[PDB]
Design an enzyme around this catalytic site. Sequence first.
Site, short mmCIF file in Angstrom:
data_model
loop_
_atom_site.label_atom_id
_atom_site.label_comp_id
_atom_site.label_asym_id
_atom_site.label_seq_id
_atom_site.Cartn_x
_atom_site.Cartn_y
_atom_site.Cartn_z
CB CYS A 47 -1.04 -0.01 1.13
SG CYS A 47 -0.43 0.09 2.85
CB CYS A 99 -1.42 2.91 3.34
SG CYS A 99 0.14 2.04 2.98
#
EC number: 3.2.2.-
Length: 252
Positions: free
Chosen positions: A74, A156
């Site tokens: 991520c 992320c």
Amino acid sequence: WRQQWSGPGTTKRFPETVLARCVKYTEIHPEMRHVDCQSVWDAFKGAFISKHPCDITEEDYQPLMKLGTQTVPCNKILLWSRIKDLAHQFTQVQRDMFTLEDTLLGYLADDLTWCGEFATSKINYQSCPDWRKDCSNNPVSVFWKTVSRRFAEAACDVVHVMLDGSRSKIFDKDSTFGSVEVHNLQPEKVQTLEAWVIHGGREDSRDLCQDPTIKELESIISKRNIQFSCKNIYRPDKFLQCVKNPEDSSCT
């Protein structure tokens, strides 16, 4: 009254291309070895055949999404809007980073078009609905809308996005990035979004990070409680060269 759709028909050899790509992808990425490619194809086809090409929904793609689930680091995501060629050349050099099309599902569908008919079980190779001229919920547009959501949603830490600084709207709130992807960046995961505004050459070496559309993007992101960062990339060609050979004298 309709006799034909306004867009190109299903890619020729669409079934062979999808099956083949899945095989090639799962061989290159040992981690996806567990994938049964014939099943992927079946799920993909099942999503749109015998269905009217203007009533496709995300559920239609649920079985394909299930079979093609892939975990991508991520903090290694590169989103892009209207500048695919550079985004793909970048990840080919910086191999630890991914664009949507570097994931199995994105790789399977990239550059392809497809659709069925509600009256038969045949693939329509004559033509397929055009998103703007015919209907938005066509097989192709719903697929990308569905997989783009999932991809952004998984991002992320620091997420990067490549933008074309030669367009009248470097950032276009009406693009997939501005409508589907940006709003799916979760602040619990994402710390900051950093845009790389690519220069084309016709424009002077102006600071495109000051552009009104970029200020718009910044506000959008700010309200998401995510930090915004923007970088100019005056020389896209030199840029790639330096990603490949970081310690080169021609690098900045």
